[PDB]
Amino acid sequence: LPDTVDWREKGCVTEVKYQGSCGACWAFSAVGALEGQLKLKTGKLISLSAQNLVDCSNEEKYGNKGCGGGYMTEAFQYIIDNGGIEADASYPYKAMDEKCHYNSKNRAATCSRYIQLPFGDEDALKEAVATKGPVSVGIDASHSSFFFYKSGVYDDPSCTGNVNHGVLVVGYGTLDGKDYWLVKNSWGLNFGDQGYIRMARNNKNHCGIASYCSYPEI
Numbered sequence: 443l444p445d446t447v448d449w450r451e452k453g454c455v456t457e458v459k460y461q462g463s464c465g466a467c468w469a470f471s472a473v474g475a476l477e478g479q480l481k482l483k484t485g486k487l488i489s490l491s492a493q494n495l496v497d498c499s500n501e502e503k504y505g506n507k508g509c510g511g512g513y514m515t516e517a518f519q520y521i522i523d524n525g526g527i528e529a530d531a532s533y534p535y536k537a538m539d540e541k542c543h544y545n546s547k548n549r550a551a552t553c554s555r556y557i558q559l560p561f562g563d564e565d566a567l568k569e570a571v572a573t574k575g576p577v578s579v580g581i582d583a584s585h586s587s588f589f590f591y592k593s594g595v596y597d598d599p600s601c602t603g604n605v606n607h608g609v610l611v612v613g614y615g616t617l618d619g620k621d622y623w624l625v626k627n628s629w630g631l632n633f634g635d636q637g638y639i640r641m642a643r644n645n646k647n648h649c650g651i652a653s654y655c656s657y658p659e660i
């Protein structure tokens with residue numbers, strides 16, 4: 443396995459999104475992982491509709507809550523169940539809950555199944571990232587040390603495995619002798635480092651990064 447992976451170098455990662463007050467991280471994280479497969483299979487890079495997930499997966503069938511939060515694995519299941527998802531350009535992000543208005547004429551991607559990695563297993567996360575591509579994961583983003591992240595490897599002892607925020611692992615590497623996961627957030631380009639964070643890797647499943655890993659198959 444390469445020391446360093448970074449999926450932007452393969453063109454598989456779209457622009458950082460800003461979710462605002464809508465608890466849509468899960469949706470962002472899930473479109474992220476499917477954008478990557480969608481590049482990797484078709485060769486095109488197209489921001490997928492995180493609104494479509496918000497609007498349409500808000501029922502007990504999934505346990506997603508729209509702006510109330512939800513789960514990247516249930517996002518993937520909705521795409522499978524629904525037979526597609528639109529691009530953002532046709533089903534755009536509004537930062538609120540709205541009535542489902544998914545139109546199959548506008549399908550831009552499909553999902554056939556999704557994979558889950560084993561809980562905590564950072565080795566399994568690395569393989570995935572290396573050979574499969576960006577992977578959806580949950581983090582404990584609840585500390586000001588994460589919010590105000592600027593640089594270096596994020597490695598705050600106060601973090602816990604109690605996850606509450608859906609992000610996308612687009613890579614990994616080593617920095618000044620600290621392993622990291624390159625994480626894409628959905629807090630706009632004023633967060634962390636160009637809207638990214640490098641998060642401790644191989645440090646006891648720091649902030650539960652490897653607790654809840656999944657990615658879709660086309």
Ligand SMILES: *C(=N)CNC(=O)[C@@H]1CN(S(=O)(=O)c2ccccc2)C[C@H]1C(=O)N1CCOCC1
Pocket residue numbers: 464465466467468505506507510511512513514579580581605606607608654
């Ligand atoms: C995003 N802006 C707010 N956070 C969420 O929607 C979180 C994301 N996930 S998780 O990554 O914390 C997780 C994923 C799989 C298994 C356990 C946790 C959960 C979601 C969340 O906080 N909730 C789900 C819906 O109801 C409220 C709690």
